[PDB]
Amino acid sequence: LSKVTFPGVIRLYPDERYVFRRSNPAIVGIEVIEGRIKPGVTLIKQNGQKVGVIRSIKSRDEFLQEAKKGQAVAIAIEGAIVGRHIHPGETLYVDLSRDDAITLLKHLRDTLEDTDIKALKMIAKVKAKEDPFWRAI
Amino acid sequence: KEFRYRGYTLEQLMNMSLEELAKLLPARQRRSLKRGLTPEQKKLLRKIRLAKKGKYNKPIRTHCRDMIVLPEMVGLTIYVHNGKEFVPVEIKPEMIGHYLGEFAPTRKRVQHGAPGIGATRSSM
């Protein structure tokens, strides 16, 4: 279980307020659409640009560990810049490993629920662009 | 806007001796008719006349590609061998004086592909 990475899809607020720092690090609020956010997980767009790795997450001044469904949290990420790299109101996807997807669909099929399966399915549909493996899911 | 062949309607062509008709055709047809018809053409012509009379309610199939179209053959449909199968030909008035084989192509049209290895000097 510790080896695989949970799927996750989020969308940036179209609100200017949530942006608290632009670069080094990029600090911006987020609401979770599906899946679970964890520290040290790479995020990619539809075209797959490496926006970096989530450096830290905080719902308040306190330090957090993870965020579940229906929770808002400010992410401080590295390698992402508003504008050229990321735009407000744009939807972000968690990069997935095909071995991890196979493990989730076959080995760890007991610990999978509605939001997780929806997120993983739509992530596979989105990633079905280059490798036919995601096309066949 | 009727049909005429040398100033004659179709019916005037119908009531003509084979010799009188031969004076209207081009030289190749005239020489072919003057030298007589081959036995195979005789059998085909017999079948055609039978079909016109009201008998022989069967399709006409023939290997004779060198038969000349004649006015009394107008209106019938003939199946001419092209090498591997018989194709239907519907005889129209403006076909008088042509060989049957002209209406049954023996080669397929060519659609080229990509040149293969050895098509140019550099590919060898």
Partner: protein, 92 residues
């Protein structure tokens, strides 16, 4: 023309590694370091980007395999028209 029978499956050659070793991408989304039997090695020339039949080794059947047959242009065209295999597997 012959089809895989058993654990065999198709594959696309990706890169030759030398000394009769190829790197074949199979239909199950795996990359395998495949070994060419010498019987057909001497008479059949294989080049990157071909449809072939690969049987995985009995032990560690995830990264090793043997190539048994090569599909010519007419055979792969017939397979594509029939629909047993798609175009994106061949094109990648």
């Amino acid at each position: 023309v012959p089809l895989p029978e058993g654990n065999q499956l198709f594959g696309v050659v990706e890169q030759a590694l030398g000394a009769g070793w190829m790197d074949v991408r199979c239909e199950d989304g795996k990359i395998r370091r495949c070994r060419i039997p010498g019987k057909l090695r001497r008479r059949v020339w294989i080049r990157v980007g071909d449809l072939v039949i690969v049987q995985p080794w009995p032990v560690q059947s995830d990264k090793r395999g043997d190539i048994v047959y090569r599909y010519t242009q007419t055979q792969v065209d017939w397979l594509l028209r029939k629909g047993k295999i798609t175009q994106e597997f061949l094109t990648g």
